[PDB]
Amino acid sequence: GSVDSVLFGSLRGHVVGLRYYTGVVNNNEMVALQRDPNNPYDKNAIKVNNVNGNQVGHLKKELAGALAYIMDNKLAQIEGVVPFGANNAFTMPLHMTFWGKEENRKAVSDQLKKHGFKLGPAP
């Protein structure tokens, strides 16, 4: 939205590890992605928090494995929305919208491609 920036595309994925956390989400709600570089199992960890800031889970490890570099180097802004399945037991769907500057679009695309991902259309 921010002027100077454009929608790049979207990805679909899942929040995992719900059984380990107590944070809850409603359908159609935004969630916050938050890097956790101190995670002692995965340096590329990305937590998913609800709008109140309580943790819900993590991005699946393959997806974090691609996105952590994009977050760390501020190559895009990534907004997550849970479209449905907010009451699921183990994993929850997540829709991610990517936006930013064109000077960074190639880098985002290359990072995703090198990890087997590809953006779909926005939002």
Place this chain on the structure above:
Amino acid sequence: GSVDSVLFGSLRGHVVGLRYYTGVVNNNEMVALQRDPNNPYDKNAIKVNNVNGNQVGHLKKELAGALAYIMDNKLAQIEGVVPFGANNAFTMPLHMTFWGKEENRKAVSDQLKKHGFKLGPAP
């Protein structure tokens, strides 16, 4: 979407009337929805413009009939993206995201349902 607005959902439709207008859209790009209340063929008309303000076409008449009331009464903000098919000669896919004040949620859904529509998952 700004606080305290919420996402209501999504709608998929088409931009029509492309053969009549000069405006070009790029694949995977935002468009502007603009009410055309003095359109003599349809008081409910909604123009679709590209990011320069040039008209590209119109929302299909059946969809405009549902959405004009929503726009005129400021019940939701509606954001349009053309996800693909931007090179189509006649009609072009359009993805609409709806957001607004949570107190308008019933009014939006009742208005859409009067015209045989409902929103899908956000965004």
